[PDB]
Design a binder for this molecule. Structure first.
Ligand code: ACP
Ligand code: ACP
Ligand code: BEF
Ligand code: BEF
Ligand code: MG
Ligand code: MG
Ligand code: MG
Ligand code: MG
Lengths: 219, 130, 219, 130
């Protein structure tokens, strides 16, 4: 009865340790995304400094260009603070493999055919870059279910020499009107996240709607 | 006149750096690139006076590109954001004339370009810490 | 011989777990300082944006003031990037209790009397703020051993209603010459870290040298 | 003319905010403070048209100060950097007329001050996320 009491006391503290390792393993992956953010905040802060140095030098030589540089400095600080907010809120970063699963189910529930010819999966992008691409792919199909009025949606995920490109095309009609990049909207927010990551967004509304989201590789 | 090649992967940064150096009366940006390969391709063909070069660039890196332009006579200044293990060492082994922090004032960078052209070598204390 | 082999196999995997908890507990304290940095980068990025908005509005109304604001934006980005560099390098943050121990031993080895009347220890400052104060207290006594030529050094650590104040006074002579805040020096670097934290540095060179380092409380 | 009290703990920020609002032809900063207590002390004594107020301030906080100026008739706009749990709730419970992100453009802030003066209430979507 003493050793059976002592075994239960050790079984209770081993449950607090092998199970408490699963709680502390969450901080290991959060440190991977925090170090990803710190790396690109270094690039962002260097850009703010250099663009301020340039706008200051232009105050007399070209005051209109100085004002243009300062609108750009303000935007870099606004968007790079939006990313800090995202990791201070501890919002879940989705893996591109998991987001591709959800978009197929969202497109099928809305009765839109999903076209996907699987190729080699991206391997040289950061977890933060991959999380941005997931949010962009999720917003792209959300726009196709609500506005496109398309029969099919072709998604491509490609790993190129210096970047990862995701193309999302629907065979519907683009419902946007002149300023299709309005404040607090998905397209503007996609362009902001992609540009913070040093990637890009290109929209081809000829023959439907084709979003091309590119994001760079590491090293 | 001092001709300059700038290699930087960050497009917004590559723009500002080019505009800042161009503003100097005695300097002019003769080429711009986004990878170490663009720097290698340019200095091999055109051969400028000075090659300002980022470290972390996709494709070929700035250290990798310095390692390939070792026997070219082009004065390479390296710029980087974070002091990382092995970067300082790899840069001195390559024979770079300058190793500076990217966000250091334009006045300092412009000075370093003139100093490097007068045979001197300028290295940054912050980039050699621990 | 089977159960003795099996017990050693479990003793080896329990050593990998109870000991590997001590490795993963390092990431818990690093997450506390990363969340401290993200909080004040939020304040720093808000300031860069607002000061850019103001300098842009002043390009025509007062171009000299616009240039002054842009030198200040460049400095905020330079110093706030210096803090990101510090946590990307994983440099050790010293506890103020431990730094007070070292300064007493450094002052005694250099034959300078250490004056300290112990009071209630600061309790409402962040770990990042406390780490900055340690670096400032360490630099203050380093300057007193190398330059002051003082007999005594009085250190005060006070917890005030809205801030923590550290006073470091020596009875030597201030050896500085006009621009006593030179580039890459300790005093300039102390002023930069303290100002990033929304604190302050005041130097009184009348009757020796008195450094007053203040840093705000949280909430 | 719209009189404004600004309460912000960040001194550099308190300066820029004051300069930006002053630049508006129809507004003028009549007081500035670094804690929620300065805001409480000022609006109780002088009573301005609008009270721009930071949340996280040492001493008394902006939410704590809004809670003490609930029955005063002063239009309080709250500004904050991060959307945090309980902040939105505490602000609506206090009866604030505005709840905005600190780094939002000056044009928007100036608009929000004029909108709040015309009885409207402006709240920020980003600050109500999850
Ligand atoms: N794939 C698509 N096909 C057709 N129209 C599209 C489209 N994607 C976007 N649009 C058009 O562009 C507009 C703006 O898209 P956006 O994603 O920015 O905002 P939204 O209308 O979806 C609200 P939210 O902010 O929640 O995304 C849409 O309202 C629609 O008119
Ligand atoms: N407590 C003190 N008493 C007397 N002189 C002092 C002093 N603290 C600073 N000084 C003077 O101010 C100068 C600048 O101090 P500072 O700390 O910035 O640089 P430093 O000379 O100690 C080299 P480092 O960058 O390693 O600190 C010193 O060289 C000295 O002349
Ligand atoms: F990305 Be570079 F090395 F600053
Ligand atoms: F610090 Be305040 F709430 F932005
Ligand atoms: Mg949308
Ligand atoms: Mg780079
Ligand atoms: Mg010193
Ligand atoms: Mg505050």
């Amino acid at each position: 009865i003493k050793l059976r009491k002592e075994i239960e006391r050790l079984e209770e503290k081993l449950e607090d340790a092998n199970e408490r390792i699963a709680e502390l393993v969450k901080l290991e992956e959060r440190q991977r995304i925090a170090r990803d953010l710190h790396d690109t905040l270094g690039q962002k802060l260097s850009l703010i400094g250099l663009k301020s140095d340039l706008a200051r030098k232009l105050i007399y030589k070209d005051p209109e260009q100085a004002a243009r540089e300062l609108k750009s400095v303000q935007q870099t600080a606004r968007t790079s603070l939006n990313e800090v907010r995202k990791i201070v809120s501890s919002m879940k970063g989705i893996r591109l493999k998991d987001e591709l699963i959800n978009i197929k189910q969202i497109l099928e529930a809305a009765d839109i055919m999903f076209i996907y010819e699987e190729e080699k999966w991206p391997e040289n992008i950061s977890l933060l870059n991959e999380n941005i691409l997931s949010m962009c792919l999720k917003e792209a199909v959300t726009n196709v279910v609500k506005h496109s009025q398309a029969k099919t949606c072709r998604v491509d995920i490609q790993q190129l020499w210096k970047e990862v490109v995701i193309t999302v095309s629907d065979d519907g009609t683009f419902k946007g009107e002149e300023n299709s990049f309005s404040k607090g909207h998905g397209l503007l927010g996609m362009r902001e996240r992609l540009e913070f990551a040093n990637g890009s967004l290109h929209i081809d509304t000829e023959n439907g709607t084709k979003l091309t989201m590119a994001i760079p590789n590491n090293s | 006149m001092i001709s300059i090649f700038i290699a930087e992967d960050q497009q917004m940064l590559l723009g500002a750096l080019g505009s800042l150096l161009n503003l100097e009366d005695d300097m002019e940006v003769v080429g711009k690139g986004t990878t170490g390969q663009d720097a290698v391709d340019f200095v091999k063909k055109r051969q400028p006076d000075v090659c300002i070069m980022d470290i972390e660039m996709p494709g070929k890196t700035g250290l990798e590109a310095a390692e390939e332009l070792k026997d070219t006579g082009c004065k390479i200044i390296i710029l980087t954001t974070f002091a990382r293990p092995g970067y300082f060492q790899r840069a001195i082994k390559a024979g770079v004339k300058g190793y500076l922090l990217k966000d250091s004032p334009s006045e300092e960078l412009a000075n370093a370009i003139r100093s490097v052209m007068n045979g001197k070598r300028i290295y940054a204390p912050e980039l050699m810490e621990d």
